[PDB]
Ligand binder design. Structure first.
Ligand SMILES: [Cl-]
Ligand SMILES: [Mg+2]
Lengths: 227, 237, 230
């Protein structure tokens, strides 16, 4: 005795995908895939996983149309065939959800690393620049004292450079040395952006986003008669 | 006995203009091309329709309803067919099943639009927030630099500006503005405007425009008739 | 009795399409569809219209047999159209007439499509001008606030080309007060892109359907004259 249960599935909705898509935009920004590309990626991952299970069937519902897909199972009873089809759909859904959990955490790790490497480099540079400028201020103070330049001798600010700092006068130069510790670090234009981007990536968690690789057009049927 | 046929294809750019405008407003450059939306909409209609051939067959008295491409190896247009008992009945039931699907798809589209609006808003609010944090951190750095320069201006005992010509001031040349102007910059720290990229203003306005979107305003069509359900002049075979 | 006339049609060639592709590039710029995508769009619209005729010609008092099929086993294009006539001259004549009839309906559909695309391209360029206008206003609004802040610093000492938020006060309170009157009446400053968008909108207004010689198909094989009846 043979009973066939049928279901029609298609790509998941933007609502079902919103969390993964948001996570992808937080990690990749403009380089993140379009919502429609993610939908196609997921139903493809689901279809390929179903096809490699390896009696069930997976075929396009309309000839020459990629979507939707008709899934079928031949059981011993109408209730069993329906049950087993829904179970196999859930089983595939979970395998795809697991391979999505891995890929996202790998992308988060790649994201975190590149951003921490970028911040570290910019921090080292900003400190080395502060350190050099301090040595330059220390050197300029010796020149200002020799030359008896106590008050600033600046007419145009452009005149003041890393090599003409003594023009600021020994009084202000001493103050700059005395107050070195509280002199702020100056970072490359994107530092703060990079640091905020990293904070937002750390806020991501797969458990928050309940992602689905498919959507039901028609749930598994209860066959009225046998084949 | 009697077959009623209809031919349906993707909606026209005119029929889709509203949904495409809503999509453009939500995603900007990331929005799908007009031709991709047309395929998505006929895709959503045909997918919903494909449940009916299966459901109508799994009845006590099975009904025959078909959805196939009109020309072999061509995705569009699609031929929808219904086998009825009478000519008037076959036509009536085909049009009813097309209307039934049309209603379900309109509801799916209403939910889709609000889901996309929610996603678009999240992305734009995340963008504005980030940009605001950056602009504040940049302002905060400048105030710290002014605070440091005020200590130098006081030690050098320079109260009035010391400079005639000045393009820009640096950490080392700020004290030349004098302790009087530097104190004023600190006392008014709060009212110093934040400086944002031109993208910021685009993003903020784009968020305002998303809030203006309403489903009832957009007359959306998921298909276009090539041929409405026929009235068969004679029975089959 | 029965005579079969056959024709093979396919997508329009790159020369037949040059004008429609030139109009689409005026409307969408770089966002305009690839020439091969336009070809498929035009043949798609022709074959869709044609696909009604087999059904409608059969559902007549006196049924007529017209068929559309792909000419090549696993190819979308070209398409083979067949008509069964009563006479040899008639089958061929009626096939060519039905191809012309579809060609006329599709030309009307294309005229409506061009105006729908012109409306969409208009909307996108007018939306672009409006955001550039919002940005230019927000920039003007920020500049007035920066000068207002600098005026507070100037009032704490000063009275009398490239300036910053920190060096504006050096222009003196007198000059700064004047700017709050001047810059507030000073017209908006837009990117050269703004005037270019206005130019692209002017070029869309110059588009006319009668100017572009539009073809939705191309003959591979014109309707045949059958040698002997069915
Ligand atoms: Cl002084
Ligand atoms: Mg910013």
């Amino acid at each position: 005795e043979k009973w066939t249960s049928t279901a029609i599935i298609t790509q998941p909705d933007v609502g079902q995908i919103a969390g993964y898509n948001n996570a992808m935009n937080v990690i990749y920004g403009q380089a993140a895939p379009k919502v429609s590309d993610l939908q196609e990626t997921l139903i493809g991952r689901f279809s390929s996983a179903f096809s490699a299970l390896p009696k069930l069937t997976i075929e396009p519902s309309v000839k020459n149309q990629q979507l939707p897909l008709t899934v079928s199972y031949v059981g011993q009873t109408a209730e069993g065939a329906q049950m087993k089809l829904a179970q196999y759909i859930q089983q595939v859904d979970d395998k795809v959800n697991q391979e999505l959990e891995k890929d996202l955490k790998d992308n988060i790790a790649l994201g975190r690393k590149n951003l921490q490497d970028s911040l570290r480099t910019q921090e080292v540079v900003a400190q080395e620049q502060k350190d050099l400028r301090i040595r330059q201020i220390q050197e300029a103070l010796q020149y200002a004292n020799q030359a008896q330049v106590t008050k600033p001798q600046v007419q145009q600010t452009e005149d003041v450079t890393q090599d003409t700092l003594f023009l600021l006068g020994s009084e202000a130069l001493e103050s700059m040395i005395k107050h070195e510790a509280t002199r702020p670090l100056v970072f490359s234009p994107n530092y703060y952006q990079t640091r905020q981007n990293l904070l937002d990536i750390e806020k991501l968690k797969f458990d928050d986003l309940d992602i689905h690789a498919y959507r039901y057009v028609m749930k598994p049927t209860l066959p009225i008669r046998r084949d």
